[PDB]
DNA sequence: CCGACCCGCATCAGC
DNA sequence: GCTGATGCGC
DNA sequence: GTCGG
């Protein structure tokens, strides 16, 4: 329930705009409309009712109308049956395959995972890993496994250097009972926004997590951001846990609070807070907040919320 | 009538 | 080789 | 696609 038909249609339309039309602002417009419609405490019986809502215009009104009177949207019906368009859309579910790679693959007749499999030579490293773990990466992670994951990360990080500080953020820090991946924020006293008194600070941590076979694969790795794969250890004759996505971001120790707000999310929440900062006359990123002027000061997450006239919403409530 | 719409890394284009 | 641009995911 | 200068 919950304007579910309209919200589902709009998200499907959003996905088509992103993956097939390569029209990112349309995708976002559909997502915004869907999220405002999902917040509406009433059942929409007309396109104009919907139109009174912020982010809903004439075209979405037109769609709600057809959908209400027919239970269907001809455009989506046609799109769903379209071999080329459905395949391009499907292939973007592989991590590392975006709209462009998906269209190039479908162009050459590569439309399915099996096509991908027998065409390894045509995949970059990221894409080969997205394909190897396609099922796993769409699996959800129970909070119980999350905590076993946090134990390992925190254990191994302090084993490299007791001065490190690791914080699991993302849906985890927001109390989610399941997560899509693990987001880890890392700080060390050597790395500060003013000087980098030690090198390899992120590398040593990844290496350690690799040595104890927690991290199994690398999708991207630079001085400040790791994107990869990890896996909880198993017991004797026990079904192996799924492989899971893990991201690690090394933030300067003096911008930890901007980091936590950033990596805690959500993504729709973030761009709803970022889109609010600009109208209060502020800029928000994972490092600072600025009027852009010098770095406005911070030592708490509520400090950011007051700046833009926002009442503190707890991590659990940032699930927008 | 039309422009705006919230950064790190891998790979590509090109000099 | 190198810079700069683009794709991708965040 | 939607909003607003
Ligand atoms: N300013 C932005 N921040 C983002 C964006 N996407 C993610 N994030 C921030 O990083 C945090 C982690 O992003 P993820 O892609 O892993 C999604 P999240 O952790 O919120 O939930 P899961 O599905 O359980 O992984 C997210 O909460 C926030 C974005 O597009 N823009
Ligand atoms: Mn996450
Ligand atoms: Mn993540
Ligand atoms: Na409206
Ligand atoms: Na993808």
Structure description:
With 320 residues, the chain is an alpha+beta fold. It folds into four domains: 1-82, DNA polymerase beta, N-terminal domain-like (DNA polymerase, domain 1, Orthogonal Bundle); 83-139, Orthogonal Bundle (DNA polymerase, domain 1); 140-262, Beta Polymerase, domain 2 (2-Layer Sandwich), CATH 3.30.460; 263-319, 2-Layer Sandwich (Beta Polymerase, domain 3). 47% of the residues lie in helices and 13% in strands. A hairpin with a 4-residue loop joins strand 10 (283-284) and strand 11 (289-290). One sodium ion (NA) binds at residues 51, 53-54, 56-57. It binds three DNA strands through residues 13, 17, 23-30, 32-33, 54-60, 95-101, 124-126, 219-225, 227, 247, 249, 267, 270-275, 277-278, 283-287.
CATH topology (fold) name of the largest domain: Beta Polymerase, domain 2
What is the level 1 CATH name of the largest domain?
Answer: Alpha Beta
Structural domain count? 4
* Strand arrangement in the largest pleated sheet: 2-4-9-8-7
List the secondary-structure elements in sequence, H or E: HHHHHHHHHHEHEEEEEHEEEHHEEH
Helix content: 40-55%
CATH architecture title of the largest domain: 2-Layer Sandwich
What are the bound molecules?
A: phosphomethylphosphonic acid guanylate ester, manganese (II) ion, sodium ion
Binding site for Mg(2+) 1: 181, 183
Cross-link (Glycyl lysine isopeptide (Lys-Gly) (interchain with G-Cter in ubiquitin)): 32, 52, 72
EC number: 2.7.7.7, 4.2.99.-, 4.2.99.18
Modified residues (N6-acetyllysine): 63
């Amino acid at each position: 329930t919950l304007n579910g038909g309209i919200t589902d249609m709009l998200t499907e339309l959003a996905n088509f705009e992103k993956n097939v039309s390569q029209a990112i602002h349309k995708y976002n417009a559909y997502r915004k409309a869907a999220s405002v419609i999902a917040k509406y405490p009433h059942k929409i019986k007309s396109g104009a009712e919907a139109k009174k809502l912020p982010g809903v215009g004439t075209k979405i009104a037109e769609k709600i109308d057809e959908f209400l009177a027919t239970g269907k949207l001809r455009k989506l019906e046609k799109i769903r049956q379209d071999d080329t368009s459905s395949s391009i859309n499907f292939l973007t579910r592989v991590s590392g395959i975006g709209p462009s790679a998906a269209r190039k693959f479908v162009d050459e007749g590569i439309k399915t995972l099996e096509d991908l499999r027998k065409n390894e030579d045509k995949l970059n490293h990221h894409q080969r890993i997205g394909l190897k773990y396609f099922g796993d990466f769409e699996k959800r992670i129970p909070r119980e496994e999350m905590l076993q994951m946090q134990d390992i990360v925190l254990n191994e990080v302090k084993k490299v250097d007791s001065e490190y500080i690791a914080t699991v953020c993302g849906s985890f820090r927001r109390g989610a009972e399941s997560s899509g991946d693990m987001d880890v924020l890392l700080t060390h006293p050597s790395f500060t926004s003013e000087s980098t008194k030690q090198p390899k600070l992120l590398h040593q941590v990844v290496e350690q997590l690799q040595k104890v076979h927690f991290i199994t694969d690398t999708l991207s790795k630079g001085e400040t951001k790791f994107m990869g794969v990890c896996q909880l250890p198993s017991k004797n004759d026990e079904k192996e846990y799924p492989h899971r996505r893990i991201d690690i971001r090394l933030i300067p120790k003096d911008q930890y609070y901007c980091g936590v707000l950033y990596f805690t999310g959500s993504d729709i929440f973030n761009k709803n807070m970022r889109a609010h900062a600009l109208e209060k006359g502020f800029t928000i990123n994972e490092y600072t907040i600025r009027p852009a002027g010098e770095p406005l000061p911070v030592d708490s997450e509520k400090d950011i919320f007051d700046y833009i006239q926002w009442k503190y919403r707890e991590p659990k409530d940032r699930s927008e």
